[PDB]
């Protein structure tokens, strides 16, 4: 079916009264005193379509003349998509566009709007209109470095921004410091005073701070590190991995000795590597920290290494990025894509060439806190396009999200996606100009450069095609993701990201989710008994009667083994030039053995880091 | 007597074994794998003197032709003055003086000395080459200014200075935020995390980080910030009064209201200030913090005030500094100058002299971390010149610490002192150029212009020709204070700044190799000199029990009249103290007003209206045992 008649169906579908809660909560627009200037989600799919839209002012291939046409044509499919949920960006454009415009230009009718409106609107953006997640920085081996950047923390944190630093350069605790003649505190200790600036600095009301925090599987105070959260409060944080996945798979098969050292301490050490491993694997367990970064692979796919380089990744792990870098994401909710037994891919690929110049767009509309940043911005202009709503979306299709069939649609389905998004990339690179880095990029110096692994779709040949043409033109350095989605599922009234179902039927902090495609397909006599036993024990499995099929179908994260979790992130890392943000869920009963197996499977599979959550464990 | 003569009596003393544990410790300069490059004070002296000796190259009234001459002279008197333990610098100038520069250079005989030898010295000194111990810094009511001074904190820290703010333009906690539409911090909830980063930065072994946060009496967080500290473990708390003692003293005394507000907020709040000060005087009691700052009280002698302001302290509330601003200080064993019952004025004026050209000099070859204050301090040329050894000075003179005769001696001293500090000053002007800012000083806009209350000197009369005169040449904003001196009287084996002895004896601790902890006794050495060395053998048991002299049998009356310690004087008399130096000071003074065990609240609250009276400028108690 054609997009257009897609967005007839949803666009006049209501958020829920719980996505209501959320939208007015922290999402409708207030003026300086308090009063809502929006009240329903109309309203913000206005506002963000129209800031959004005047972006294409920019562009060179439209004749000043055609302008104003052009742009309303780009703010009306860009409001449709947007108020029927089937495309949301990530929070952080739905709080700020429009900042520092008048209200009387951000809401009005768009066959009202001039070419000077427009230019008002763009020139008008204030100095906190902020729309994107995620952003890295450095922290640097002097206290000059350190405390920059807990500048940087502050005023990222401020404006709306998830940050994350690798913490590798600040040399061991002891080492020697020239300057003082003294000894050194250590990364860990340092974290402390970032953890410390960001107690006192959020986004008001709507957003605290959320920070990453890594240190590389070699550095001298790894051990310290893995058991730091055990304060810390802000960070997650992951150990990082630098080197190849094969060669730290081999050390551990062959029982292998890493050696900690750093390029400004006389600290050294021999750890087997089993033993680190250990170590993790037993925090993880009790306390789901640290989790893994693979740098090395993400290094292996990103198209301007070695001469940028991946340190680490936002706090949730979904995008590498380099230093000052950050970027944009935005979901589509696949579920609304269900067509009587199939996906829509008609309409599905007309929606990923939207989405990806909307989030294109976003960029030449962002405002960030530190030049820095918007220079890294501008010359990769990378993208994080994901999706969102695919665990309801196999409900409706009847497949169980633990089984290869399930794993076999999600390559197929990323497979899709990515084609398409990185053809709308090529448009764009012809349409607005490449990005700067693009002569200098894999997709230019080299041939047969893929920024995934693949090998789990039949697209496979055509999306080899796809990046060749894409040596001579190319928007965007990379463009994919799937993101944790937190808010903007809630928003859609649809599933997490690539997340199943964590309960079927549940209360949130007023009540109360209860699954709408188990609500629209188990026998609505047979639901109002079990009810109480599900909301109880939290799955189907073993309530009888509910017919096994519904049971098989309808599950939830903790009818899911390990290994599943596990393996369908591979699937969809196949084909994400990004990463990919996923909880590996674990039963109250798996062991720290259950957790080293896993971590070792992650290690032959194609994914880019790992989080492991145990039930029960905090 | 010449002070030459005085040079050459105490130049071949050598310090105390304990002094030396200090020198050894963080004094001795070590090289990048640890040896020693010096293992006497001498050696120190050495490298010190050289360096400051290295600002001549910059005087303009020099001939190249007498350059190297005139350079080596006064490396040659500075290293004298030095070795005797006469005059000795803030730490910082000891410490770091010659980073940078070359090992072959430092400490190499004087006459191998070429003025390439001096140039290269100068040009290689670098960026850790700080040697003031004195800094404020703004903190501006956004994060990014809050931010920024953290890490000015930490950059100052680094180097072994010691800092200060006023936290009052932050505005209250709960105050609207426009940007994010939320709800301020307030500037208790900022300062804990200054003092987190201040936790993780230091001078290595040598110097933990020092701070200084005032909050001014009218902040609506006032309340808050005065129980702060009952965490905030690097900093001392001061609440501020930036407007006339006066007036404070008259609200207090018509059981009056103050209202507290901010600029940056809507909410008002009035208090009963003798509510205030009860609150101040109870926490003071339990803690010895907060302190007061009478900022009102500097500004009415502050030169450039309202050009530029004073908001804020250092560390130990003894100079007030406007925005950016630091000061280098120093200080004269003035215990060293005693003469068969008199202090020997000959020599005590040259020193002063050669002090205050000492400590203009550091300025010229001190590196800051950050422009704002490279700036600032060039443009005002602020110094701290003070002494040391007072109180044993007294006991020579066979003088009382708690009786008005040492009091019209402290401040007959600290007015002589004065006079020649400010006639040097006008001496420099000439010789080497006023400060940049002298045009705009209250020494050019004014007549009358005196940088202190004085009225307790014969004094008074010249000290006003004197300041006339510096209308037209003054190499310095201001030039004395009387700092603690925690460590350099130590290092010149002395009693400390101007405060009494503590105790007169005590068990010295000395590592052995073997084992233990060989105690010593250590008896104050004028006590040594003085008292029947049979008598003290037989009551030094009681004297270490009791740690005073007073309640012991058979210890002459004079003796005990004499010789005594902190607690032995009462709080008014260490409060009067305190003014009479403060009325011949023009920075300001550390003084801790010791109070007994048996103190009450009200007897604090006494001492901080005695101090409203008073010409002090600040007021910090400690109550024995409290802590
Ligand atoms: C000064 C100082 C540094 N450090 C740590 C911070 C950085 O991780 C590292 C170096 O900080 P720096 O600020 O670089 O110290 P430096 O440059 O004077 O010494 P070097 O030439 O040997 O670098 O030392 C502390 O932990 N505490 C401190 O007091
Ligand atoms: C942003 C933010 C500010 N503050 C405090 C810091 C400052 O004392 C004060 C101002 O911060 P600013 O950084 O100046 O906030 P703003 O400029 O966006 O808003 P305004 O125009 O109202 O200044 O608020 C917090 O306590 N928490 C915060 O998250
Ligand atoms: N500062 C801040 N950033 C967050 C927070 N939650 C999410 N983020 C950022 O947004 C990214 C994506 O999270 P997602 O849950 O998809 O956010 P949504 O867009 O709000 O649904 C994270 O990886 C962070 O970079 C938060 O509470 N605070
Ligand atoms: N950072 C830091 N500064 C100090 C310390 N002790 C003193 N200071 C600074 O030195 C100034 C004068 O102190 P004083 O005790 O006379 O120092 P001394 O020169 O070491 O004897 C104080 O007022 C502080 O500003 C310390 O331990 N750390
Ligand atoms: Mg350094
Ligand atoms: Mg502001």
Redesign the interface.
Same mark, same amino acid.
Do not use: C, D, P
């Given at each position: 079916m054609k997009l257009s008649d897609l967005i007839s169906r949803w666009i006049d579908v209501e958020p829920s009264k719980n996505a209501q809660i959320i939208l007015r909560d922290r999402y409708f627009m207030?003026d300086?005193d308090?009063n809502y200037l929006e009240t329903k989600w109309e309203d913000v799919a206005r506002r963000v379509a129209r800031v959004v839209a005047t972006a294409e002012l920019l562009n060179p291939s439209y004749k000043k003349n055609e302008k104003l046409d052009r742009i309303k044509e780009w703010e009306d499919i860009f409001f449709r998509v947007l108020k029927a949920r089937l495309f949301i960006p990530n929070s952080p454009t739905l709080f700020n566009a429009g900042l520092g415009v008048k209200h009387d230009l951000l809401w009005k009718p768009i066959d009202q709007m001039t070419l000077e409106d427009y230019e008002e609107i763009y020139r008008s953006r204030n100095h906190?209109h902020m729309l994107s997640a995620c952003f890295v920085v450095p922290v640097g081996d002097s @206290?000059?470095e @350190?405390?920059?950047a %807990? &500048?940087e923390y +502050?005023?990222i944190t &401020?404006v709306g921004g998830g940050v994350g630093s690798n913490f590798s350069e600040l040399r061991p605790k002891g080492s020697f410091? +020239?300057?003082? /003649?003294? &000894?050194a $505190?250590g990364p860990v $200790?340092?974290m /402390? %005073?970032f953890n $410390? +600036?960001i107690? %006192? %600095? &959020?986004?008001? $009301?709507?957003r605290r701070g959320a920070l990453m925090g890594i240190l590389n599987i070699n550095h001298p105070d790894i051990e310290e590190f893995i058991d730091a959260k055990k304060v810390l409060n802000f960070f997650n944080l992951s150990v990082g991995f630098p080197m190849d996945k094969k060669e730290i798979l081999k050390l551990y098969e062959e029982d292998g000795e890493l050696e900690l050292s750093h390029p400004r301490s006389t600290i050294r050490k021999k750890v087997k590597i089993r033993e680190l491993f250990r170590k993790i694997a037993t925090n993880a367990w009790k306390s789901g920290d640290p989790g893994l970064a693979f740098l090395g692979e993400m290094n292996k796919y990103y198209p301007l290494y070695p001469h940028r380089k991946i340190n680490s990744t936002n706090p949730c792990g979904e995008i590498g990025l380099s230093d000052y870098e950050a970027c944009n994401l935005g979901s589509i909710d696949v579920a609304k894509f269900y067509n009587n037994g199939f996906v829509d891919l008609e309409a599905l690929q007309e929606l990923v060439q939207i989405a990806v110049r909307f989030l294109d767009n976003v960029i030449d509309v962002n405002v960030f806190p530190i030049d820095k940043i918007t220079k890294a911005v501008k010359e990769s202009r990378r993208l994080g396009l994901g999706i969102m709503g695919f665990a309801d979306l196999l409900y409706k299709l009847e497949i169980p999200y633990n089984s290869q069939e399930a794993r076999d649609f999600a390559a197929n389905l990323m497979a899709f996606i990515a084609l398409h998004a990185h053809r709308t990339s090529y448009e764009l690179g012809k349409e607005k100009g490449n990005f700067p880095l693009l002569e200098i990029s894999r997709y230019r110096t080299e041939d047969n450069f893929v920024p995934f692994a693949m090998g789990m779709s039949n697209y496979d040949d055509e999306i080899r095609e796809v990046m060749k043409m894409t040596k001579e033109f190319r928007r965007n350095v990379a463009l994919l993701t799937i993101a944790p989605t937190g808010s903007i599922s809630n928003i859609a009234d649809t599933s997490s990201g690539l997340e199943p179902n964590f309960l079927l039927a549940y209360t949130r902090f007023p009540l109360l989710y209860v699954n709408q495609v188990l609500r629209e397909k188990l026998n609505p006599e047979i639901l109002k008994r079990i009810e109480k036993e599900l909301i109880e024990k939290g799955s189907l499995k073993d309530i009888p009667d509910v017919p096994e099929k519904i049971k098989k179908v309808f599950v939830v994260a903790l009818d899911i083994d390990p290994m599943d979790h596990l393996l369908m992130q591979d699937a969809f890392q196949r084909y994400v030039d990004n990463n990919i943000s996923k909880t590996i869920n674990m039963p109250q009963s798996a062991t720290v053995d259950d957790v080293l197996n896993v971590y070792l499977e992650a290690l032959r599979t194609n994914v880019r880091g790992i989080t492991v959550y145990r039930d029960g464990s905090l």
């Open positions: 207030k300086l308090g906190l @206290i000059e @350190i405390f920059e %807990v &500048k +502050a005023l &401020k410091v +020239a300057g003082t /003649h003294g &000894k $505190s $200790s340092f /402390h %005073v $410390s +600036a107690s %006192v %600095v &959020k986004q008001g $009301s709507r």
